[PDB]
Design a protein around this ligand. Structure first.
Ligand code: HEC
Ligand code: HEM
Ligand code: HEM
Ligand code: FES
Lengths: 49, 378, 49, 238, 100, 55, 73, 65, 54, 54
């Protein structure tokens, strides 16, 4: 997903440990608006809309 | 002497269907054995003819069942008979279970255990048969419940990679599920014979709970023609379902080719799994939710071991009867909440209904039983 | 005291041909039998259809 | 915008339990599909041999089957030439591949029209309202790569409304409005969803008469055999 | 005490009085109940099985008795209870003697 | 009517089975004509026989 | 649990039993079945029905709560 | 060509609830033309108007069709 | 029972269905076979009735 | 898979690609062969020692 730097600020203005999964936004991909994901919901295997 | 009392097969026929001393007190709520048996043999026949025209492959299943319903003569009604006969079999199965819980016949312990194992087997057969048409709903529900089996730590990952045959629901998974749905009703019939064996060890049950050994009428020809009456009632209801409204039960998305990317938003199992599924999505724990389902079936195991009453049935215990009817309404409540999209008031009332289910069957049954007990100078 | 045991009558129950002690039972049997067995015969025809 | 509009149930000629389908309307709707809508929508599970005794005739089925050439097999060289085909013909794909249709649009694959009535929440009336209800966006347009349609989950479609005052002005009188072509395509999609409709209604009539026959008889026989225990009485002898 | 009136309301709403039954009828059967039924005189045993068979007939045909023949809260001739007491006390005697 | 019918067709089993098979074929024929007439009668018009009768 | 012959030991009972051809097919159906089913209906009204009206009230309450949440926005 | 469906829709949309939904959509237009620079942009009143209008046309459709 | 005008896919599917469904029928009839044998009793090599060496 | 286009290749997939599918195919075939061996030996016994009176 290509995103916006303002969408990166919307994503990362909330802190890392607020989520139940502690993961920093810059840890997820090196080119930050180009987020690269194994796109399947890790609960029970769905594709989120 | 008498040909029925000499031939060894005819001795089995005589002990099964002629010289069975039956209770004379049982109304139409005891016809369910013959109903489930005739549903089972009709499911055998319909699935057999389907298997004479079905292709177990991911590429060819949808087109082949389309070829059945459009090209093979009467294959459309045979498919409708198989699916709606599964639904009618489920209705009769739930009401057989409801009779067995309401009239106190669950004191028969090992017969109840055999019935629990039969319930396991019918659930598994139902799910894999529903996987077989290679629909979008079947694909995503199989993925979800396969991950539910992968919820087990350190054993579940190897077990799910063992049942895959790949990374996901691919051709190996499709053919393996075809094999298991294709073989299991014979084992269901064998354990049904075991079920019948333990019951004919014990003897059947009347509404009163008092054993009717002074008032035994035979199984023939009274119950034979009464079961014929109930069976042809099932015939007319089932066949009018398959010939007037085929779409009141079947999902619309079930007629779509499987897209491995979509996840349509009203993804759900069929209605006979939604109460199994409403317990899942209203508990924010994967292993906790599947353990809650397994513990619901284990509660159905437990309930013979908590009959702390002094009657047998709830026929003369009206408080426990009213709690039973609240449980009936709560079951239909959980089924309808399984039939809704995930919504916040629906979330609240689904959690309240599931915890109400557990509190009624687990806690409120010995409480109601002991109020009924100590109330009657006991 | 075994002769002190009398049959309760079933006047609410018997057929309208059987509402009289005058009538010979060998003279009204075939109406009842033909009616009931005609019902069973038409049942058999529908089942065989 | 997460507020779907549910289609009402409409007064069709196939409404009731004794109701039927217009095969002449099926003929009109297949002429509509073959002459308009087959170029964008696949209906691959319908053959010309499904169109023999339903509405058409025998020789005109050969005429329709020779109107569309697809392919013959290997001519000892695998040349795969163009063959008319007499009766075994199926309906050709507009696109050989899904991404051929994806590159011909903004993705958004046109589905196969075999099962669409029985395949969405809302049947043929959903199709009718879908083809009918086109208007203008008051305030909400999203990227101008799609169109506006209220009867859609997501409320935007990439399909242009293909009606626009007599796209065909076809064979008989029947003025090609939105309504006539929409009724004909809904009847035809209902027949494509179920190839066995009026046969099912005929068997339903047979079955209602037979169950009106059996239910006095079998209940009478059950009452007759259980009539002995309904009549027994008890007495006490010490 | 008003709990007697609650018992009266319960015995109204039970229905075996409307079926004309006593409290010593619908006990669930273990083997201790079987022993207690076996420890009874012949007259009460035959009257009990006569009541059971009349109740099974009137429960099959469901044409339940008129008001007048219905047993009441006062005239409930309960008799199995001291025999049941003696059977359970012999069973507790045996359990205590084994666990001693 | 009833006495005649019981005295003829209800005392031998095989003759009973044969006459109910014969009457079953006759009733099958009559029910074919009746059911086809009713179902073509309540859905006149949009039926394929008349559209083929055009041609 | 077994066959006949050994089940119970009961004296003092005489059962009268009527022929099936002796009595009618439907002995007083309408004059008895309707008051009997009225009695069986009244015997279960306050035990069967109050769960279902709770079902319908929670149905309408949660439904109108969903509607009210989805009609302001 | 005189299309009758537009005629039926225009003759049915003067139902009292349909007129009230028309002014509900117009007051939504008053709010959005008043409060610009927003993403709450007249969906609900539009679908409510077409809801009531297409229900009344659904009541009275197949007379000319 | 051709499944067509000759052997085709329908013939293969019908044969697959019967090759699956007959062995369990064989198993049940084998149970009936052994049940009649236990009704009678087994047989020695000599053919002499052997009730006295059970 | 019982499909005449893909049956031979599916059997080849069993024998080569699937782990030990070759030993299971050979086991099913030769076990059917030894089933017939034991079958005709059992029939020959039942006629030879004279247990056919049952
Ligand atoms: C080419 C342009 C056409 C033509 C001539 C028609 N359709 Fe439509 N259609 C087209 C596309 C590119 C799409 C995809 C967008 C989408 O699916 O949202 C569609 C969609 C449909 C659908 C799907 C709607 C749904 O499932 O909710 C249907 C049922 C449909 N199209 C039908 C249809 C009919 C009956 C046509 C003849 C009048 C027709 N389309 C014309 C592209 C095109
Ligand atoms: C798999 C489907 C099942 C079949 C085919 C089946 C079959 C039967 C049959 C034939 C009978 C005897 C006739 C009758 O009263 O219905 C019976 C009785 C009974 N079954 Fe099942 N059964 C099934 C499921 C279950 C289940 C899940 C239970 C619960 C554990 C159960 C518990 C009982 C009990 C308690 C009886 C005796 C009821 C009585 O005496 O009246 N059965 N069953
Ligand atoms: C051994 C006997 C059986 C065979 C061979 C069999 C075979 C099949 C096949 C081939 C299918 C896929 C085709 C289709 O979906 O129409 C199927 C589907 C199905 N089967 Fe069975 N089946 C058998 C017994 C049962 C039983 C006992 C049940 C439960 C009552 C059952 C329930 C279902 C269901 C629910 C489906 C899905 C129906 C659908 O989605 O169309 N089957 N079965
Ligand atoms: S939330 Fe359960 S799978 Fe995505």
């Amino acid at each position: 997903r290509h995103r916006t730097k303002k969408e990166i600020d919307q994503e990362a203005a909330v802190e890392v440990s607020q989520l139940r999964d502690p993961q920093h936004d810059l840890e997820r991909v090196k080119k930050p608006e180009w987020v690269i994901l194994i796109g399947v919901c890790t609960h029970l295997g769905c594709v989120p809309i | 002497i008498n040909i029925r009392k000499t031939h060894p097969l005819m001795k089995i026929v005589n002990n099964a269907f002629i010289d069975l001393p039956a209770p004379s007190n049982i109304s139409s709520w005891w016809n369910f054995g013959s109903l489930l048996g005739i549903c089972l043999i009709l499911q055998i026949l319909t699935g057999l003819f389907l298997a004479m025209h079905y292709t177990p492959d991911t590429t060819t299943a949808f087109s082949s069942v389309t070829h059945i319903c459009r090209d093979v003569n009467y294959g459309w009604i045979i498919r409708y008979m198989h699916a709606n006969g599964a639904s009618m079999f489920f209705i009769c199965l739930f009401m057989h279970v409801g009779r067995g819980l309401y009239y106190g016949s669950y004191t028969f312990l090992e017969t109840w255990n055999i019935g629990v194992i039969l319930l396991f087997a019918t659930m598994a057969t139902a799910f894999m048969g529903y996987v077989l048409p290679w629909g979008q709903m079947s694909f995503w529900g199989a993925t979800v419940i396969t991950n539910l089996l992968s919820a087990i730590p350190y054993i579940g990952t190897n077990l799910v990679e063992w049942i895959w045959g790949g990374f996901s629901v691919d051709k190996a998974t499709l053919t393996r599920f075809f094999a298991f749905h294709f073989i299991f009703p014979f084992i269901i019939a064998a354990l049904a014979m075991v079920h019948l064996l333990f019951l004919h060890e014990t003897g059947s049950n009347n509404p009163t709970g008092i054993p009717s050994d002074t008032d035994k009428i035979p199984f023939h020809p009274y119950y034979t023609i009464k079961d014929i009456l109930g069976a042809i009632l099932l015939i007319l209801i089932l066949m009018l379902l398959v010939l007037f409204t085929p779409d009141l039960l079947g999902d619309p998305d079930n007629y779509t080719p499987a897209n491995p990317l979509n996840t349509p938003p009203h993804i759900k199992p069929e209605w006979y799994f939604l109460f199994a599924y409403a317990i899942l999505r209203s508990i924010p724990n994967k292993l906790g939710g599947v353990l809650a389902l397994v513990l619901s079936i284990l509660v159905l195991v437990i309930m013979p071991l908590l009959h702390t009453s002094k009657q047998r049935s709830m026929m003369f215990r009206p408080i426990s009867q009213c709690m039973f009817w609240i449980l009936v309404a709560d079951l239909l409540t959980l089924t309808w909440i399984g039939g809704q999209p995930v919504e916040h008031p629906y979330i609240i009332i689904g959690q309240l209904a599931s915890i109400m289910y557990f509190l009624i069957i687990l806690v409120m049954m010995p409480v109601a039983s002991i109020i009924e007990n100590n109330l009657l100078k006991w | 005291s075994h002769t002190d045991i009398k049959v309760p009558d079933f006047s609410d129950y018997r057929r309208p041909e059987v509402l009289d002690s005058t009538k010979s039972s060998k003279e009204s049997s075939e109406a009842r039998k033909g009616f009931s067995y005609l019902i069973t015969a038409t049942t058999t025809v529908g089942v065989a259809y | 915008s997460d507020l779907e509009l549910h289609p009402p149930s409409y007064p069709w000629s196939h409404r009731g339990l004794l109701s039927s389908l217009d095969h002449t309307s099926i003929r009109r709707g297949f002429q509509v599909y073959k002459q308009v809508c087959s170029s964008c929508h696949s209906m691959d599970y319908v053959a010309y041999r499904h169109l023999v005794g339903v509405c058409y005739t025998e020789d005109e089925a050969k005429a329709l089957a020779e109107e569309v050439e697809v392919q013959d097999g290997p001519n000892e060289d695998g040349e795969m030439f163009m063959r008319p085909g007499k009766l075994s013909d199926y309906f050709p794909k507009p696109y050989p591949n899904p991404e051929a249709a994806r590159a011909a649009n903004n993705g958004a694959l046109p589905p196969d029209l075999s099962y669409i009535v029985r395949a969405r929440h809302g049947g043929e009336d959903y199709v009718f309202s879908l083809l009918t209800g086109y208007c203008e966006p008051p305030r909400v347009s999203l990227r101008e790569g799609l169109y506006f349609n209220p009867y859609f989950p997501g409320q935007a479609i990439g399909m242009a409304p293909p009606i626009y005052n007599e796209v065909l002005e076809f064979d008989d009188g029947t003025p090609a409005t939105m309504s006539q072509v929409a009724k004909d395509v809904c009847t035809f999609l209902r027949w494509a969803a179920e190839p066995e409709h009026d046969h099912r209604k005929r068997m339903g009539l047979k079955m209602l008469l037979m169950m009106g026959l059996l239910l006095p008889l079998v209940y009478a026989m059950k009452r007759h055999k259980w009539s002995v225990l309904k009549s027994r009485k008890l007495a006490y002898r010490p | 005490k008003w709990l007697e009136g609650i018992r009266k309301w319960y015995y109204n709403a039970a229905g075996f009085n409307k079926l004309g039954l006593m409290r010593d009828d619908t006990i669930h059967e273990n083997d201790d109940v079987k022993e207690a039924i076996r420890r009874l005189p012949e007259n009460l045993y035959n009257d009990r099985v006569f009541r059971i068979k009349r109740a099974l007939d009137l429960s099959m045909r469901q044409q339940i008795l008129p008001k007048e023949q219905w047993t009441k809260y006062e005239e409930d001739k309960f008799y199995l209870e001291p025999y049941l007491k003696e059977v359970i006390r012999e069973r507790k005697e045996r359990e205590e003697w084994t666990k001693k | 009517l009833t006495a005649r019918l019981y005295s003829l067709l209800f005392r031998r089993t095989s003759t009973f089975a044969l006459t109910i098979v014969v009457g079953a074929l006759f009733f099958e024929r009559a029910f074919d004509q009746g059911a086809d007439a009713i179902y073509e009668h309540i859905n006149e018009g949009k039926l394929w026989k008349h559209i083929k009768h055009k041609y | 649990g077994r066959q006949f012959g050994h089940l119970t030991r009961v004296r003092h009972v005489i059962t009268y039993s009527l022929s099936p051809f002796e009595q009618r097919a439907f002995p007083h159906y309408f004059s008895k079945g309707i008051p009997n089913v009225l009695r069986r209906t009244r015997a279960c009204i306050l035990r069967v029905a109050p769960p279902f009206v709770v079902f319908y009230l929670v149905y309408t309450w949660g439904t109108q709560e969903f509607e009210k949440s989805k009609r302001k926005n | 060509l005189v299309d009758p469906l537009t005629t039926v829709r225009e003759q049915c949309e003067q139902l009292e609830k349909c007129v009230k939904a028309r002014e509900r959509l117009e007051l939504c237009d008053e709010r959005v033309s008043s409060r610009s620079q927003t993403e709450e942009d007249c969906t609900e009143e539009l679908f409510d108007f077409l809801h009531a209008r297409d229900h009344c046309v659904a009541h009275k459709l197949f007379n000319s069709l």
